[PDB]
Amino acid sequence: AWKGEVLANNEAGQVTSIIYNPGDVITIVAAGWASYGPTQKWGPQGDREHPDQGLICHDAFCGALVMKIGNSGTIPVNTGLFRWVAPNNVQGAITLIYNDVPGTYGNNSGSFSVNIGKDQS
Ligand SMILES: OC[C@H]1O[C@H](O[C@H]2[C@@H](O)[C@@H](CO)O[C@@H](O[C@H]3[C@H](O)[C@@H](O)[C@H](O)O[C@@H]3CO)[C@@H]2O)[C@H](O)[C@@H](O)[C@H]1O
Ligand SMILES: [Ca+2]
């Protein structure tokens, strides 16, 4: 089980110690406040009013928490996942990422605190 911080201005994202293996069931809970530029801050679901200007994850709002499992595309996490199972052939290290447009991460601020564990399976 892993606990750590995911900085909004961390473009490469935060690698975790969780390796998702076939058949794993995982639960994630994310909390906190971040911004992708403005003086306002948003939670892990991001800013529901803001258009997509080339986000790393087109399936979540700008300012939301997303992840990659190994070589995968981005997958929405938002506030978290309850006893979640990945698609077939998705496996590897979980990297947690703040959803912004590539190259726009420098004006970001705040972070989300995140817990990940593996469930019974
Ligand atoms: O989308 C990710 C980026 O969001 C922020 O950039 C925004 C900022 O530059 C504002 C300035 O007010 O403009 C935003 O785009 C506007 C556009 O200027 C308008 O013509 C249009 O009507 O609306 C859009 C959306 O509000 C722009 O999105 C951050 O500053 C960047 O770092 C990125 O994270
Ligand atoms: Ca930004």
Side-chain angles (χ1 to χ4, degrees):
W2 178 88
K3 180 185 183 200
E5 208 71 43
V6 175
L7 270 47
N9 78 337
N10 187 5
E11 178 163 21
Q14 177 63 67
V15 71
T16 70
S17 63
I18 310 298
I19 312 198
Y20 186 91
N21 297 307
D24 284 342
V25 183
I26 69 177
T27 302
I28 308 182
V29 182
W33 303 99
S35 173
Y36 57 86
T39 60
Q40 276 194 253
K41 298 216 193 299
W42 296 265
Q45 299 183 148
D47 178 354
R48 64 196 293 261
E49 310 196 348
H50 192 68
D52 187 334
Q53 298 169 331
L55 292 165
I56 54 153
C57 188
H58 300 304
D59 298 339
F61 293 132
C62 194
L65 181 63
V66 312
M67 69 181 181
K68 290 187 196 190
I69 296 172
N71 270 326
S72 77
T74 55
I75 299 169
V77 183
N78 295 309
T79 61
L81 302 173
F82 194 74
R83 307 180 177 170
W84 177 97
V85 177
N88 191 225
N89 308 139
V90 165
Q91 73 199 63
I94 306 176
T95 302
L96 291 163
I97 325 144
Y98 193 74
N99 200 24
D100 210 352
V101 177
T104 73
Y105 280 77
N107 70 341
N108 297 0
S109 65
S111 64
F112 299 136
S113 178
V114 180
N115 281 276
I116 308 179
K118 307 204 187 165
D119 296 308
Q120 281 173 206
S121 58

